[PDB]
């Protein structure tokens with residue numbers, strides 16, 4: 662029973678070994694709290710052998726706001742003693758321009774995953790960065806709200822089905838600001854915040870069975886570290 666290491670030993674302990682397959686892990690926080698950095702690191706980590714904290718897997722990265730950085734991936738990979746070429750090849754990138762496209766990409770994801778399912782290097786990670794931004798900007802005023810929840814609930818149900826069918830970890834980011842409220846399902850929720858300079862603090866939010874707590878981690882050349 663394998664898990665995906667975050668690159669941080671303290672964060673992994675908080676998560677029971679790392680982020681799980683057949684589950685939706687959400688990281689939520691303000692802008693600059695390291696949600697995208699954690700997503701980039703996991704996209705590299707998944708490719709690693711189990712002994713190095715990975716699952717010899719492929720990753721898919723759905724980018725809704727234009728935050729994906731292939732150069733950052735090359736940097737993380739090189740700093741972890743890996744081929745930069747192979748890392749970029751093993752991260753399937755999809756730029757989502759609206760909520761409809763974002764939802765459709767979850768079927769496209771299914772198609773590419775069923776094909777690699779029984780192979781040596783299957784998909785093991787799906788990143789949605791960020792899960793709710795398109796739902797927040799598109800459904801304007803009352804009268805758009807019932808449909809906004811209907812669409813979001815359907816999108817999360819598609820992600821859950823995908824995680825269970827293909828034994829993949831679904832890692833999602835969500836910008837929750839101190840000052841819109843988009844209720845949705847997640848297996849695990851983690852609150853992220855700054856942070857003593859480059860230090861980030863992670864807190865488990867109503868995690869079932871896992872003991873309550875916090876983990877401190879850094880944003881380095883290696884992505885995420887203790």
Ligand SMILES: [Cl-]
Nearest residue numbers: 777780782783
């Ligand atoms: Cl393959």
Ligand SMILES: [Cl-]
Nearest residue numbers: 809810843844
């Ligand atoms: Cl909603």
